Amino acid sequence: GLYKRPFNEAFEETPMLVAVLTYVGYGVLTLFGYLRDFLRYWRIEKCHHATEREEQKDFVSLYQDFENFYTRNLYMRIRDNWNRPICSVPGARVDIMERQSHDYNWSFKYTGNIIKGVINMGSYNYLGFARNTGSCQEAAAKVLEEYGAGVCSTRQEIGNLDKHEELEELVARFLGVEAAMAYGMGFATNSMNIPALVGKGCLILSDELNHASLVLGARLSGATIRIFKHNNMQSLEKLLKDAIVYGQPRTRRPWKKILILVEGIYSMEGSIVRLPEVIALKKKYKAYLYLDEAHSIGALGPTGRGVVEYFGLDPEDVDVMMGTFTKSFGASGGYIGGKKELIDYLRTHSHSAVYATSLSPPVVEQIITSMKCIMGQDGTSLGKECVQQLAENTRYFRRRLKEMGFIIYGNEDSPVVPLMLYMPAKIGAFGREMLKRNIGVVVVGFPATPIIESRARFCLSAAHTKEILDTALKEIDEVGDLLQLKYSRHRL
Amino acid sequence: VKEKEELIEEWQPEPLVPPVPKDHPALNYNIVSGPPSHKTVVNGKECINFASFNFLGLLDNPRVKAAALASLKKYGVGTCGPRGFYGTFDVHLDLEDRLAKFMKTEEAIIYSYGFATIASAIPAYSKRGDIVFVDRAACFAIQKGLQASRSDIKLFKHNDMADLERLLKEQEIEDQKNPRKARVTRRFIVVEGLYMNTGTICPLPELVKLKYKYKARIFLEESLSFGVLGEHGRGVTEHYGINIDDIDLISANMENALASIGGFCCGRSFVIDHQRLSGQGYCFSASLPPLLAAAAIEALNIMEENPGIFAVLKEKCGQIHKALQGISGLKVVGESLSPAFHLQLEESTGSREQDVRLLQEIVDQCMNRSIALTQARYLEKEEKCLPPPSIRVVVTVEQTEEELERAASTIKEVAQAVLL
Amino acid sequence: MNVGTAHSEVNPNTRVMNSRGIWLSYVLAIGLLHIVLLSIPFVSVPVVWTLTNLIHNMGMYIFLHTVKGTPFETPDQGKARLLTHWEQMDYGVQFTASRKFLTITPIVLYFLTSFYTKYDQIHFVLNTVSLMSVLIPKLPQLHGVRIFGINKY
Amino acid sequence: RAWKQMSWFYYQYLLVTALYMLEPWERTVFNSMLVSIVGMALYTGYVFMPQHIMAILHYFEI
């Protein structure tokens, strides 16, 4: 397969000095954690933890202490960066309730003051559909007044409604596939529909960076799971060759099926999947394709049909097209699209179709209005402006950050910008300093990522204007000067 | 290289989805032309709702709709992120506090999906090497939770404590064989307050005694009993009077009684605080939309304001269960206290498909007669213990006495005509 | 942070030894320990080298072969609560550049300390028993075996 | 001006050595251990090692 347009991505390497200092910091933290555990065990220092009731003291201990090591010794120190409560619509500006801790993040108390007008770079609204006032909100209010909030039964039983059928046909038209089915949770979509498609005796090939839902869905089904490297089509090709040739491990028989699980945009890495080469490989080796499009269904594409439109490919090549309405459309949910036979088989044999409650009516109304706005059935020019503004903001932000000397991951087109910090203390420092300057960001640490690579992710939006981006960029420059976060050799 | 090549060439994969016969009843979906409520319209036929898990009739309450509308105007529809990353609203914390105060417990955690609640709660505590004693008639959510965990699963007969004691005693023998492993193995007992498949209640006092005797923790599922049982409707613990502190973890969903999407787990801080970091459905998924949380809070306020609705529901369940007794070919399975019970075929013929067809004939003829019934749906190849096919009868405080008598009568004539 | 947020590995621990700059950091750590030992006035150079070898081997034994499990909760549902770090490394693949480096470096330190200890008998027996203590578990034959039931549970 | 620069240098030392997250008594323990090691090293160098390095530093200062 070939690319009609250039495919630009950069993953700079960690400078050796920074790696050495990273390991120094982690070693110091480990040693002081062991000391703190020794102090707490001998009751020399009182432990601020809940303990089991006296009636159950002779039972086997519920948890293993070593498993909680990183939680007490390292996570607790910088716990204030996460779980920040908000009290406003998560737009371009958000209101964060303030909290203070006097026992080093072990317990939090909410002061009266609330921070207002924080620039929001943690929420997932790519097209800026999270508004408390709009046409979508009015339609949702009307359907809430009519249908009520929530349904009390299952789809196969009396719980199926007409709104759900309307949403399913609208989604099928939107993606370009023949049929689609909607679910009430994006995580449940994968976790409950990967087991139905594939069972024991089949092979599943997973990327290194698959979401937890895809991995859980693969585990629940009995299929063998083999992991190829991130966007390495040499690894995928070699795994396909060996799987077809050698067969099953215990008794070398042909695999019943081979399923390849991939994603459109990887949120943390920032990269976009090399879809043309994956499609070429699956056609050559007769393997099926499962494409998760949670992050790319609204952000990518000239009009917004996803990665398949972005590359210009054919939707009929992708066997299963998963997706989530939470990120772009601004309402919770999930969907799978494909052939009519596949959709009917899922309608009969999906776990959530049989046992789990169907989606709330106001949510499907909000999804319908948002999707009609995106494809332009209403006739308003809001559909094109949001996508164009998202693309412009992405390019401007990424370019001007790269020209300040930072290290950034991923393609030039992806609207997620992971900046790299590389040091455990700089995670907490960056989070606190950015909040102090009215900017909200998301930071991740060692158990989540590779040990050397610790990052802060920015999620751009069509709601961010040039003024907001310029303010954020000047604040980021000031912080990077303060914390010395410009590790880029190519640029200064 | 060439032998590798046509080894690649000769292989042929099985089709992704098996060819589906059109005879599947689950293929055809009932289409409800409006909200599923009292006096609903199904398939274009006006009917009285006897299939929706709406026990208290809070789905259509103007107070709930007003609260949901106010919260929708304040926040919108979407939360746009997990609870870790700017997805926590003040309504979520308020709802968790309200649930903790309502159930008289230290802490509660809310998930955005009823299935994920227990399917994520169970694997968080039960790991590989542990021992889980789970009832045979356990819903599919519990089964998927136990499969996600890799612990050893031991099944015992439904509501039978002799089999539980037998398994516990064999475990004590294996304990005596090797103490070193015995000191690091944890034992759990997963039960349900009011079983959905069979409509039968569980023996809590015996379970608590066995817990304290054999050092095994207890996990309880209260999906159906959360809003129907007890003087204040706090579950089966209030029904039996058992102290809630004996039960380690109590999980339920907000869909049935509270009539909004979501689910929750309640317990002491010691057990609950682990799920905030190890519950997969919690860590890696978006939070509950604010309007649903506000609807749940308003439903809790209504439930706390007056406690007589539970008594009304209890008396209606008693009346309908007494009335349905005496059908020729159909037997009632369940208890008088249960709101949702079953009607099964007394004489079971060899084929399950034809049993399903007979029950479908009964259901269709009832629907033509303005009684909207349903049939319990299962995944035949997936369930560990597949229950018999049955017609589900559900009772709601809204249904008047005369409507209950007409429903029982109509089911009676339809069943007698069909079985004849 | 939670395990699995930015990668699909059930056990990140198995790869911490293959990361970038870990080997150079290990070497610099040994050098820093040696310099800290040299900082002691009354201690003499051969017993400095004996102390360097003994402390290095003791710490390496404690970390690689004594402590078992994972410091963080892992979503594979406890593969490796019983396995030690050496057994966990690389999912049980017996040879690897990391394993070869880790098992080669104590022998190099032993040769250096034997040279600088003036080949004395007491130092020889101490250093050699320490080297045997470290090198015996590294054998592929001794994988997941506990002698006399020590550290099994 | 020198005070601000030294404060910035101490800030960088905290960030690099991960002392930024440790509690004050842990910071003091680590600092005391470090200064003790530095003092013992300089004293041992002065007792045994020749002061040619000190002479080189003095010549560079001049």
CB A136 within 8 A of CB B76: no
Instruction: Report DSSP state, residue D19.
Output: T
Distance of CA B200 to the CA centre of its chain: 13
3-state secondary structure of B23: coil
Q: Is A60 an interface residue toward B (CB < 8 Å)?
A: yes
The H or E element spanning position B271 is helix B269-272
* Distance from the C33 Cα atom to the nearest Cα atom in chain D, whole angstroms: 11
Euclidean distance between CA atoms C143 and A88, whole angstroms: 56
Q: Which of B85, B150, B210, B394 should be substituted to probe chain A, the one whose Cβ sees the most A Cβ atoms within 10 Å?
A: B85
Q: Which is it for the CA torsion B233, B234, B237, B242, positive or negative?
A: negative
| Beta bridge partner(s), residue B341 | B393
Question: Considering only CA atoms, which of A367, A369, A371, A370 is closest in space to residue A183?
Answer: A367
First to last CA, chain B: 70
Q: What is the rounded distance in angstroms from the CA atom of residue A375 to the CA atom of residue A384? A: 9
Please name every residue paired with A458 in a beta bridge, in sequence order, or none if there are none.
A417
Length of chain B: 420
For chain C, give the number of residues.
153
φ/ψ of B247, rounded to 5, equals -85, 125
Closest CB from B123, B181, B277 relative to C153: B181
Resolution (angstroms) equals: 3.1
Neighbouring CB atoms inside 10 A of B96's CB total 18
- Residue B238 in contact with residue B92, Cβ under 8 Å? no
List phi, psi (to 5°) of A152: -110, 20
- Residue found under tokens 């399913």: A168
D14 touches chain A (CB under 8 A): yes
Q: How far apart are CA B83 and CA B89, in angstroms?
A: 9
Strands B371-372 and B48-49 come out as parallel
Give the tokens for residue B138: 């356990």
Provide the terminal-to-terminal Cα distance of chain A, rounded to the nearest Å: 36
Kindly give, in sequence order, each residue whose CB lies less than 8 Å from that of residue C130, ignoring residues fewer than 6 positions away.
C53, C54, C57, C58
The structure tokens listed for A106 are 């072990």
> Which chains, if any, share at least 3 CB pairs under 8 A with chain C?
A, B, D
Asked whether the beta carbons of A328 and A127 are under 8 A apart, the reply is yes
Give CA–CA dist A391/B165, Å, rounded. Answer: 65
The residue to which tokens 């310029």 are assigned: A470
Query: Could you count the other beta carbons within 10 Å of the beta carbon of residue D36?
Result: 11
Question: Which stretch of DSSP H or E encloses residue C60?
Answer: helix C45-61
Q: Which residues of A are less than 8 Å from C74 in CB distance?
A: 67
What span, in angstroms and rounded, lies between the C-alpha atoms of B150 and A67? Answer: 17
CATH of the domain at B105: 3.40.640.10
Q: With contact defined as beta carbons under 8 Å apart, do A448 and A442 qualify?
A: no
Measured in residues, chain D has a length of: 62
Q: Which two tokens stand for residue C100?
A: 């070869």
Which chains have 3 or more CB–CB distances shorter than 8 Å to chain B?
A, C
Residue-wise burial string across A332-369, b where 16 or more C-beta atoms lie within 10 A, e elsewhere: bbbbbbbbebbbbbbbbbbbbbbbbbbbbbbbbbbbbb
CA A198 – CA B17 distance, rounded (Å):
9
And the tokens for A198?
Answer: 């594939």
Q: Do D44 and C35 touch (CB under 8 A)?
A: no
Q: Which residue has the tokens 């089709």?
A: B15
Residues contacting residue B375 through CB under 8 Å, at least 6 positions apart:
A157, B356, B359, B360, B363, B389, B390, B391, B392
Given a contact cutoff of 8 angstroms between Cβ atoms, the answer to whether A213 and A191 are in contact is yes
- Domain span including residue B218: 62-305
Q: What is the DSSP string of C74-137?
A: -TTSSTTSSSBHHHHGGGG-S--HHHHHHHHHHHHHHHHHHHHTTT-HHHHHHHHHHHHHHHTT
Choose, out of A67, A204, A205, A452, the residue to mutate when testing the contact with C (most C CBs < 10 Å).
Answer: A67
Assign B243 to helix, strand or coil.
coil
Check B148 against A220: CB less than 8 A apart: yes
The separation between the first and the last C-alpha atoms of chain D, rounded to the nearest angstrom, is 25
- Cβ atoms A109, A100 nearer than 8 A: yes
CB B184 within 8 A of CB A60: yes
Largest CA distance in chain C: 55
CA distance B67 to B298: 7
Are A417 and A464 a contacting pair, CB within 8 Å? no
Catalytic residue flag (residue A295):
yes
A164 is catalytic: no
* 3 state DSSP class of B156: strand
* CA dihedral angle for residue A227, residue A229, residue A231, residue A235, rounded to 10 degrees: -90
Three-class DSSP labels, chain A: CCCCCCCCECCCCCCHHHHHHHHHHHHHHHHHHHHHHHHHHCCCCCCCCCCCCHHHCCCCCCCCHHHHHHHHHHHCCCHHHCCCCECCCCCCEEEEEEEECCCCCCCCEEEEEEEEEEEECCCCCCCCCCCCCCHHHHHHHHHHHHHCCCCCCEHHHHHCEHHHHHHHHHHHHHHCCCEEEEECCHHHHHHHHHHHHCCCCCEEEECCCCCHHHHHHHHHCCCEEEECCCCCHHHHHHHHHHHHHHCCCCCCCCCCCEEEEEECECCCCCCECCHHHHHHHHHHHCCEEEEECCCCCCCCCCCCCCHHHHHCCCHHHCCEEEECCCCCCCCCCEEEEECHHHHHHHHHHCHHHHCCECCCHHHHHHHHHHHHHHHCCCCCCHHHHHHHHHHHHHHHHHHHHHCCCCCECCECCCCEEEEECCCHHHHHHHHHHHHHCCEECEECCCCCCCCCCCEEEEECCCCCCHHHHHHHHHHHHHHHHHHCCCCCCCCC
Q: In what order do the strands lie in the sheet with B263-267?
A: B107-111, B263-267, B249-253, B217-221, B187-192, B131-135, B152-156
Q: How far is the alpha carbon of D60 from chain C, nearest alpha carbon, in Å?
A: 25
Q: Are strands B152-156 and B131-135 parallel, antiparallel or unpaired?
A: parallel
Element (H, E) at B372: strand B371-372
